[PDB]
Design a binder for this molecule. Structure first.
Ligand code: WHL
Length: 132
């Protein structure tokens, strides 16, 4: 047969995510990791699959793996915050989303209003949690 390159399996998991096959996509990213475990995006992409699967702990651990490879990652800080938000770790979530925002400015990355909106939503969810 043929065995793909790590890059080729990342491409395949990307297509599987867009096809809404999230456990399959996540396994594809694991196969990419087997070939090259030093590529941050494989872990962040797999964390998005885990989030869609409502597996917050597994997504969180992949965000940590990505952050050990790229400490400047907007995407890893953003999805770390999103994992924490889903787990109701509100203050940690907001700080990581704010760090994502600052990094994106430093890097001149345009996500429209997505990060400010994500913060507003996070702070409102936190506020509602405090007011009971
Ligand atoms: C390039 C790429 O992956 N684009 C893309 C478009 C639409 C969506 N939508 C959903 O997954 C629901 C994902 C990725």
């Amino acid at each position: 047969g043929a065995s793909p390159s790590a890059q080729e399996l990342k491409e395949q998991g990307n297509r599987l995510f867009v096809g809404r096959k999230y456990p399959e996509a996540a396994a594809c990213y694991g196969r990419a990791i087997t070939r090259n475990p030093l590529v941050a995006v494989y872990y962040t992409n797999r964390a998005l699959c885990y989030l869609k699967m409502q597996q917050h702990e597994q997504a969180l651990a992949d965000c940590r793996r990505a952050l050990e490879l790229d400490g400047q990652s907007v995407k890893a800080h953003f999805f770390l915050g999103q994992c924490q938000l889903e787990m109701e770790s509100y203050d940690e979530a907001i700080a990581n989303l704010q760090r994502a925002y600052s990094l994106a400015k430093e890097q001149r990355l345009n996500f429209g209003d997505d990060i400010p909106s994500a913060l507003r939503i996070a702070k409102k969810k936190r506020w509602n949690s405090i007011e009971e």
